[PDB]
Design a protein around this ligand. Structure first.
Ligand SMILES: NC(=O)C1=CN([C@@H]2O[C@H](COP(=O)(O)OP(=O)(O)OC[C@H]3O[C@@H](n4cnc5c(N)ncnc54)[C@H](O)[C@@H]3O)[C@@H](O)[C@H]2O)[C@@H](O)CC1
Ligand SMILES: NC(=O)C1=CN([C@@H]2O[C@H](COP(=O)(O)OP(=O)(O)OC[C@H]3O[C@@H](n4cnc5c(N)ncnc54)[C@H](O)[C@@H]3O)[C@@H](O)[C@H]2O)[C@@H](O)CC1
Lengths: 327, 317
């Protein structure tokens, strides 16, 4: 019954794409009743590897895969897209300093912002994964004249899921019984996973674990998790990041559970006093393609301190990119 | 919900393992209401990497992942196992040690009705070593994978005839996962029509067979790495279709221990057309085997017989 939706994925021959594409075509992100057409974008150097990825997608014989196309032009990839996952971003290079990374990214994200505005569905839903995700989502929406800025989001779902995994281990309860986790700010060393509103089986998180543990054990371990993986595997956490990507999209399109919320970085409308315009991770509920920030939570001083630091870091990078005339 | 099943997976820190585990834990293999306990086995030198994979699985916050354990001991990994996916193999003697030790561990500690899928190459021969060395377990519960070749062939047919992949049924790949496997278009249907009515015999033998056999190499030449995601997909489907069952009017390819079917030597692990229902499979017997098909069935049966022989020579079985 359902007509196919078009899903654009950039960075498609990369590591995250290699763990993401198969699970999307199997129907894990938008439902087992919803056929998908994948429109994959790579840079010209990666096209041959992308062709090999395309062959492996064909070799899975996915009944929901209604169409598959690979290109190196952003106007063909985003053509009529319903969803766009912007995973590609500039690589890191030797002695290539921060502003230099900002500049290169500014380039990709301006171009892609423009392309979306010209050829995608007007209500295209956009997820930016490529780092730095928050600032890249800022640059894209500001270059996508004609699209609603609230359709541009950035991922904090990996940090959210890591925080829920640690709390589950600590309190010895199934991960399916942790609710109301929040990660505020962005995917960085300074993100703030908030346990003041979380619940473990119905009980408040902070009745089961103490502040000492929270502040000197839990916080640093979530912030170090990505480094731990790299030290153990010798490669970054692609499967777990692809999984967070899928969840971020699924929960947005299909809706969040009753009584719960998820973390999403979205353009601020001054909620909790966070400056307008910046892309900032908030507690959010969704229902049918739309989300709203969860307002009214009580912020203590511990919280506010941490939320503010993260707002300031994002305000600064925004400063830099403005200074580069990127926005 | 059902009670959890223990799924053991060897070679867990490798390439297939990395594309396999998260889909299993997500409920793609046994269903969304079946929680799973993952029991992962690696060699001691890949244990560090393995702990990294464990960390990533935790970080998916999967509701159906009821437990996770990583080990370098087969007797720990296979304990009370209900399903075992044997992916790790030797980068004949060396494989032989692996498969006898693993076949023995399974017999000692796993469930009596443990279902086993051998992926590590050479898969058909490796499944023979294990079953032969797994005194006490039903040898028919030991299978090898030919589902990847099966899926590739469906893919090529769909592409040729312009039809959707979901409309191709009754593909068969006889023999093993090898350059001489035989993908049979004689009984396949494309949108209810016989395949060979839509496709000619010259394309079949000149274009189709060679292109399916070369598929793994095309991928390596393209990506610079072998086909891990699509092989993991094929392994998931092999298990799923055996555990849940095949669709009505259809069949799948699996390599199973021969019981003389189609005149194939008893004992060697050989790929046939099978239907399955709730954990048991049955060979599709009584198909018409023409002469073009027999020669090819013969060749691959021969090769398999040699290795069998060779393996006895080593006193492995
Ligand atoms: N926000 C988050 O929580 C996370 C963000 N992450 C970011 O995820 C991004 C991708 O990570 P991978 O591990 O897959 O990186 P890979 O280097 O494996 O893949 C990146 C891919 O991007 C492609 N690419 C580059 N520029 C492109 C462009 N202009 N158009 C289309 N494709 C282009 C490259 O050709 C490459 O294939 C990185 O920026 C990474 O830092 C990950 O670290 C996951 C966590
Ligand atoms: N049957 C078929 O259709 C296919 C079979 N294949 C076979 O699949 C196997 C794995 O392929 P990959 O690309 O993952 O390989 P990788 O080299 O990436 O990984 C294999 C893993 O096996 C582990 N291992 C080795 N000996 C082990 C033992 N005694 N116990 C536990 N773990 C052990 C290694 O430490 C390694 O992590 C290879 O034999 C490959 O040839 C694949 O090529 C897919 C197709």
């Amino acid at each position: 019954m359902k007509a196919p939706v078009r899903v654009a994925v950039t960075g498609a021959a990369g590591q995250i794409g290699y763990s993401l594409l198969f699970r999307i075509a199997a129907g894990e992100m938008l439902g087992k009743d919803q056929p998908v057409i994948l429109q994959l974008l790579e840079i010209p150097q990666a096209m041959k590897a992308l062709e090999g990825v395309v062959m492996e997608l064909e070799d899975c014989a996915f009944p929901l895969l209604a169409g598959l196309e690979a290109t190196d032009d952003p106007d063909v990839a985003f053509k009529d897209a319903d969803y766009a996952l912007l995973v590609g971003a500039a690589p890191r290079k030797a002695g290539m300093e921060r502003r230099d990374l900002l500049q290169v990214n500014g380039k990709i994200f301006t171009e892609q912002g423009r392309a979306l505005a010209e050829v995608a569905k007007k209500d295209v839903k956009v997820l930016v994964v490529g780092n730095p995700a928050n600032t890249n989502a800022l640059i894209a929406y500001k270059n996508a004249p004609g699209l609603n800025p609230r359709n541009f989001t950035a991922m904090t779902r990996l940090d959210h899921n890591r925080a829920k995994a640690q709390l589950a281990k600590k309190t010895g309860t199934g991960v399916d019984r942790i609710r109301r986790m929040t990660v505020w700010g962005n995917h960085s060393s300074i993100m703030f996973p908030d346990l003041f509103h979380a619940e473990v089986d119905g009980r408040p998180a902070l009745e089961l674990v103490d502040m000492e543990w929270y502040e000197k054990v839990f916080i640093p371990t979530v912030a170090q998790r990505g480094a731990a993986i790299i030290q153990a595997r010798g490669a970054s956490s692609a499967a777990s990041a692809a999984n967070a990507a899928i969840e971020h999209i699924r929960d947005w399109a299909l809706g969040t559970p009753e009584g719960d919320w998820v973390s999403m970085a979205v353009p601020s409308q001054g909620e909790y006093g966070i400056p307008e315009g910046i892309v900032y991770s908030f507690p959010v509920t969704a229902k049918d393609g739309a989300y709203r920030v969860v307002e009214g939570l009580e912020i203590n001083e511990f919280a506010r301190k941490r939320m503010e630091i993260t707002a300031q870091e994002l305000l600064d990078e925004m400063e830099q990119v403005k200074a580069l005339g990127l926005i």
